[PDB]
Amino acid sequence: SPIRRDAFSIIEAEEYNSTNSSTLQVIGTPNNGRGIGYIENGNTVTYSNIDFGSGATGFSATVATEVNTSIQIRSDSPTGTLLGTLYVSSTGSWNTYNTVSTNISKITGVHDIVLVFSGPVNVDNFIFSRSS
């Protein structure tokens, strides 16, 4: 998977750098894209060297799920700074994707990003939004 990436261009969830998961699979999406699924509570997924430049204050992910769930967004490691939490309610099916966004604390420079899952969700991609 890429060693580094820009925070302000689409990051593919299936191009992760490490995970603790023993269940996670790369899955297909309805329009022949890919994502990650078979995710369980406590799973972490790490994306290396995301460059936030002069600042990001939002996060958007394209997700599908049939359960209410949340995803923590952490910097540097699973126990690094909690930037925010994305709360996702059911999108209607495991193949109905929705773009969902949340606020995060302003982060700058280059950091790894860890997504921490409280339950099953399928994730196609995500992107950050620049600070004002």
CA dist., res. 124 & res. 75, Å (int): 20
- Say which entry of Na ion, Ca ion, none residue 12 contacts (CB below 5 to 8 A, set by partner kind): Ca ion
> By CB neighbour count within 10 A (0-12 exposed, 13-18 middle, 19+ buried), where does 32 fall?
exposed
- Pick the binder of Ca ion from 125, 126, 127, 128 (CB under 5 A): 125
Nearer Cβ to Ca ion, position 32 or 79? 32
- Which CB sits closer to Na ion, 22 or 32? 22
Q: Does 122 interact with Ca ion (rule: CB under 5 A)?
A: no
Q: Would you tell me how many other CB atoms lie within 10 Å of the CB of residue 56?
A: 22
Out of Na ion, Ca ion, none, what residue 125 binds, judged by CB under 5 to 8 A for its kind, is Ca ion
Two tokens at 102?
Answer: 């949340």
Binding site for D-xylotriose, residues? 29, 38, 95, 122
Residue 16 tokens, joined: 């992760």
Stretch that binds Ca ion, among 33-41, 63-71, 104-112, 113-121 (CB under 5 A): 33-41
For Na ion, the closer of residues 22 and 31 by Cβ is: 22
Q: Please give the residues from 45 up to 84 whose contact with Ca ion meets the rule CB under 5 A.
A: none
CA distance 61 to 104: 13
List residues binding Na ion (CB under 5 A). Answer: 22
